[PDB]
Amino acid sequence: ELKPKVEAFLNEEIKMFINGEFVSAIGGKTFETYNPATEDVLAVVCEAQEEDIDAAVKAARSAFESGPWAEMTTAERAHLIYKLADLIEEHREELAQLEALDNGKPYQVALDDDISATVENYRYYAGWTTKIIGQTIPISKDYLNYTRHEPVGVVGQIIPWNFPLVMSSWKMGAALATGCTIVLKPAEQTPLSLLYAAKLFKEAGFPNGVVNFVPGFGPEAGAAIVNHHDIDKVAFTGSTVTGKYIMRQSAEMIKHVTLELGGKSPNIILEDADLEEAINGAFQGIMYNHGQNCSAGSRVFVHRKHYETVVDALVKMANNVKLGAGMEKETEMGPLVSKKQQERVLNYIEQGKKEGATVAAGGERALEKGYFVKPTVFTDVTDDMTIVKEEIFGPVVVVLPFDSTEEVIERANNSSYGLAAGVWTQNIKTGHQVANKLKAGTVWINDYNLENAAAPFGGYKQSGIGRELGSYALDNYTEVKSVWVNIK
Amino acid sequence: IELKPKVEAFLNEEIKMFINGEFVSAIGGKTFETYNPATEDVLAVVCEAQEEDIDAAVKAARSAFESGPWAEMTTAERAHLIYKLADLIEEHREELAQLEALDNGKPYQVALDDDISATVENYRYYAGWTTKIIGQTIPISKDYLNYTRHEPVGVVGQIIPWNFPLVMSSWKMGAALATGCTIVLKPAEQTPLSLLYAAKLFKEAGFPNGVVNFVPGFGPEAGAAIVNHHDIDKVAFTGSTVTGKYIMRQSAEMIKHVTLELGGKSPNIILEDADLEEAINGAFQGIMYNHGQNCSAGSRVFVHRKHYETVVDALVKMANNVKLGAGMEKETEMGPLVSKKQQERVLNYIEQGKKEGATVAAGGERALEKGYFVKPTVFTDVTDDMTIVKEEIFGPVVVVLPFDSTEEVIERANNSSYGLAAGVWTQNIKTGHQVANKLKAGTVWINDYNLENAAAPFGGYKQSGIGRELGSYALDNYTEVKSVWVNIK
């Protein structure tokens, strides 16, 4: 049941946020975001067009070059971010509702995970503002040599629909900590939590233009950000094919890019694993957020000695999953985010059936309505298949037996992807050895799907370029200047 | 200057490629010619890497990265190999400086004192990094050990231009090799000699087979095969902004990390309170160093109105007094440009200048009987939207602009797609740092110009580059950060 501030918010046209003001599109167009558990329209939103992206970029450029954002001390900047975090925490329940409704995930996990992490991320990054240090370099008695880590300037950010608010925080936390200004676009299907959070940027005291939110569609608002001549740097998270596109376009202006694409991450259960823990880790690893997770462990490699114990257990778990609307207290898994996604993963499940794999559970849709799909366990698979090699992005897992550690490493690494990996073993040497050999940005030994503001994440190979979170994200938003002072 | 015996021996034969630790000819036998730009005579004939050879280099590098000594070796051991390489280059210093003078055209004494000495210092610097490329331990929670590993990216493909051939090979390889990567490297068709000579030293220093692979040839074939290679993990390139676009565009298809150092049109600013004597020398050397074939050349000298007339006079005199000649002639101060193609390209820029109405206060035409030479040139009476004021010429051509206020010169300096470097001349402590902070450029020299060192990073803002070379910074380009979480609950 709706919180009064959520009811109030949804009782009207959702404005975009530009130069510190809530505004309609210049051309006046609007679009609809739906509630995926019911298919009804949830809200009507102002539709950012190229001309609006261009007003936003002008606002961001002004805030970066002159005014309080440019003049502020690092402590002052830090306090703004810290105050933002406090405000988000205060509106925690309203934001969790907005995510549960717009995105579809269960309210309680949006609150406990998503919202909670957004808060922590902004607090972490506030801490960095006064610590982005450069170097003094002893080279010669004749010169003072030093580097300055300057903000890159105006940055364009594109956010997908699977962790809407949290992902906005990854991107913004680091960029704002360096002193940049932002032009950010949420996904067409999940613009609500961010647009609601814009009230909190204004209230925390952000100067006008520091952040600008332009909801809209990829090919118009999206592309306007990527192709914009006055945007200094771009960051994107999405499909590998759209990633290729952003990079291609960014080339035209020798523009730095940061991308986090998808994956087909392996979750490995070795013979000496703690089988109880590994099975729960294997199930959560794919099923968390309905499989709508870049780093989902969509390949559970299990040691031949435990294939059957595991495959059984995952089937019983997969059946037990209570599907429902996110705003229902008993819902464990919600629906996918859109009809397009629902089709897209149903078409993977069949494409896989037509390829010869068999279904130990799921493989269809769920409930009377909503963009739902049953949690699905595939069995009898081969490394060359479509469903083994490609990111499905639904709650579908392929389980593969193996007979040697050297084999599982080779097969785990035989992929164009390399976002993440899990390794379950109790042996100290094996766990480090294997994690060392896996070609992925993040490896969890005896766990899976753990993220924190302080630990970087991202892909090797076609899973991305660069890293998000940690100190590391900060380098994406900086231009290093080397100053030499002749003191001969 | 007389040829060294080891140079003579080297040029007395077909110049071979280096792949998998062996000197070899192109698989299909093709060869090409490199010239002596001061004479136009062929200097040597070289084996010509084709796509298939790049394929062989890449497989050798893949194998040396995945298994064998370079993969097993301690950081100390890798470091010592790199240190032994530097000692060897130092030993062959005179031979290498000769090759560079003959093949590139620059004067022998500066190749020795500058290029070859910097190459040695860069490898020594980077050897020191092997044992210090540290990751982090991150305290987050009592229930986990969190740590990062900075792993070498793998096989890296590198393309270097022709203006600082040996040194630029060192910028690239120093950092890559320090992280544990393996290299497929392509020198410019115009200047493959110093690199291919130096290959001997990689072998003798004890590099294992395939750790480094040198494939000379042409951009459209050898270059493209590197850029497009499915098994090359990361690429680095130095050159024109236009080819840079190409490289990044191509790298997109594989989600491949890029490092680029492109051109510039760097401002060199003389403020009113500058030590005008030192400023004049810095202005002149900032453009004329290496015949202007320098990314960071101070190609736009901005001069406070009060001093404009005075420094234009001096740069004109200095221009007209430089001794043009063959690099291997001891009286030479400036050699020719690198190729007929560059000589015409630059000449074309000067014509466009005159035609756009700028004045030629000095130079403006070719020099001597043969060779790709161009007279030092000073353009005057110029304006911000002129082709010559805005575009990288890459020859010994300067454009001199007067200005009236500091806010003005900052704005006009920054009004460019480029942002590689800048010079600021002032004796005031506040003005010098204030102006340096406001310039959009990777490197600013206060009361100096054109200084590089292994320890200080270099690169561009805007369309002058992505990423940095030199210093600790370069290392981040050759690494993949891995975050490991160990549940200890």
Add this chain to the structure above:
Amino acid sequence: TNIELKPKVEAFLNEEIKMFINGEFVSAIGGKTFETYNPATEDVLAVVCEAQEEDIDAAVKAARSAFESGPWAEMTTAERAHLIYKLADLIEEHREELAQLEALDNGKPYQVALDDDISATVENYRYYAGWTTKIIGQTIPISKDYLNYTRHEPVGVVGQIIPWNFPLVMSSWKMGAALATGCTIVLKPAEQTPLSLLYAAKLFKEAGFPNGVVNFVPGFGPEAGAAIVNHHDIDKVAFTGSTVTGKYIMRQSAEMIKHVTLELGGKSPNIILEDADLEEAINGAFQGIMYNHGQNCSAGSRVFVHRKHYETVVDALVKMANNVKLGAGMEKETEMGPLVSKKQQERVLNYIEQGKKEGATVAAGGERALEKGYFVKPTVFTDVTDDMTIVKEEIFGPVVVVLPFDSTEEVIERANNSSYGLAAGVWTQNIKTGHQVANKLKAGTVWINDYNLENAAAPFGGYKQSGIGRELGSYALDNYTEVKSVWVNIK
């Protein structure tokens, strides 16, 4: 015209001031109390519980327990960070109260306490709260056979002793860094200035610090102080004060092989070169020594002036000194309050007498001021030589010596010819001179065309006998940690 007492201050002062141990406000085990005075009036400001050895022992046991188990030991770094953040928010909420206490107890002007001290306190906790999640060790690539990593672990129970010149802010320098690393604390404010800290204690409780993570033990140097210094179970010591007392602390710490951090005095030089911007340099020179009544480690107590400008600077510092409005801290027109105590006033008056005895000239001030309170007139000495006591020794009063010089090489040699090396300032418009002279001065901090600037992010401390180690900045964290190097065989 009086600044009106804050109701919460009045309430605080209306009762015995308790100490803080294991999360509770308590009296001393033996019931002793001591008096703290208002140095402007000489009246008693409050009666405060006096910590004895037995009380330090109780605080150390509490701290030990909070470090070894309990929430502080189990909390994530984010959670520890949030505690620090909220404590800085509470400090800010009580900004006026805490500034009135500084003014009343220490003597300094209220507006300065507010704008400087309290605000710096707040920022210092905010800064350090940011470091909690960022205190990182290394992964070291050595060999394929081993995973090599280091951990920067909190050293443990830390003993901290704070002087009286910047009471609250000094407590924050000490505690912010240490708390950021996960340490637990036993801290002693100065006998003369225990109030601001004991009031602050309400705020540590309110923010939610677990029991015993911080422990405040007011009292005397020889009983409470020495008990901290000499305690078998305090893992590390931090101190700021006199160079003589510093020696004692290090000598005692030798017996347990205990890491020590110390910030001691100085005789910092403030150098005006020929090409200085004279108007800015005169103001810097005057504030450099007069700020906080000269009760400042880094005070530019030696003003070196290039021969050309010497007389011009002397005349200006004389006029400025004579124009200072002295008065109580809690009075709005006050620009410079009294010295912290009778003993300190007597100490500086003696130094002035020595200066006169030794042949120096009192160009201005040089005696006590007003009817009541520990006041001393801002003082300017001329006709001094390098071998004089007043030029070599820390006075810790609003007293300055002015010295002319003829060359840069000379001033650098004279500035460095001292046992001290806390700070220096250099005034010159020339880019090369600025940096060259900063490079040559043996001081932990050098201000070029400024003076007395401090920030949470920038380290502070002494060369030579001005100290060991640094406070503030990232640097201050390493004094609070032990480095553990872990080798994991992965062969």
Add this chain to the structure above:
Amino acid sequence: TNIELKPKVEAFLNEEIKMFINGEFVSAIGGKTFETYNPATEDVLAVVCEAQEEDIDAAVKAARSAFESGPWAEMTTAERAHLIYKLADLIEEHREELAQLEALDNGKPYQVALDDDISATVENYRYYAGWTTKIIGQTIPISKDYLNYTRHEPVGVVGQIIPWNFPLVMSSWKMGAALATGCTIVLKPAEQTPLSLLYAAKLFKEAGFPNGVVNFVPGFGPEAGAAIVNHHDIDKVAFTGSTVTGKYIMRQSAEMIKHVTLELGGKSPNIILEDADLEEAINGAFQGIMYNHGQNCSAGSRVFVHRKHYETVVDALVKMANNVKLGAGMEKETEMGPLVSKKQQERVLNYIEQGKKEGATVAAGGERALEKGYFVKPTVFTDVTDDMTIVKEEIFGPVVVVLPFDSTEEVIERANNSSYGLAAGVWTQNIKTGHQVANKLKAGTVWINDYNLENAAAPFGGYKQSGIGRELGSYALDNYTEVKSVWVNIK
């Protein structure tokens, strides 16, 4: 079977061993000399000039001048890096000669001196040579009004005292770091082991070090030693040795507010858990203590064993103990040499006697060995309790105590119940337990499924009474630096 002397070693020993001060080899000012012995034969190995207080003064003046002016003060970081690298190349070229001196002078087996000590020396200089160009300070973004930056300056003239157990390699730990930062050195080798260092001195001269940058003063603790510790012009001190002497060094340093780095003893525990890999763990336990004849600060002198495995490990260590081939270092079959001196033999035999007196069982060894030279049989004590003197104190001989335990919580408590805290080893195949137990042990270094691993890149040092500070790694550089924070007003 004797290892044949190298011509150069024979030529060196053929004469009086000179000291090295201001780039030249010279006699003591007062003509005094002392004898260093060969601990396997008890014969005099060489006569060496004995540095007095007057000699140390000469060395300090030389180092001071080298630090303040001349080539070392003007060299670029690359140039100073090159000197370090060349020195390492020279050490490598004389590897056999240096390993022979170590064996002869210290008594350790030649092959070990070679493969270990002398190769670690080389690598240690190569490592620190690489740091020369990378000792960076910070640019700190604080305000648009200022450029804030720090400089990590060399502290200056550093006094270094090194013991006799790893002569040459210890000199390298200390000088590598301190030389990388740009400091100058006054170093003293142990009375008993001056040869390898004085021989090495030729290499510093040959590598091209400027006059005075390194100065070697061999002699005695209470004369040459104390004079370093007490010199007014030495800016920092570093010492390795006994707790008791460490206390003295820190007490003396207090007088000048001088930074101290100390590595003292330990009683390190080597823990074998129930799921350990027993074969690996037994070898590691045995080597953990027997390496270098037990003359090792980090020696696993307390072998803790899980009850299940206690008797198996005891029998195994008894058998290995009695199988070691004792002999001269210069004899090819030698596995363990003598102790360094009659005095050290008398001390360890004393300890063994006390062990027997307090009720412990000598399961093996426990007496002297051979007919001449300072040998002691590898010894294994059982039937031991935590409060015995041999369990608590550092023996510094090839003596070990074996103790069973029944829970992991118990062994952490017993291992940590010590004033020492140098190192620990943990043997277990479980990923969780390894890290957990490593995290809870209070030791500077923890090896998981190994023991006695050292590397230039990894820090080493003690918690508690085992020391202050760290050596090796990037960390060791901080000990040789003074941090200067520069503020440039750019308003």
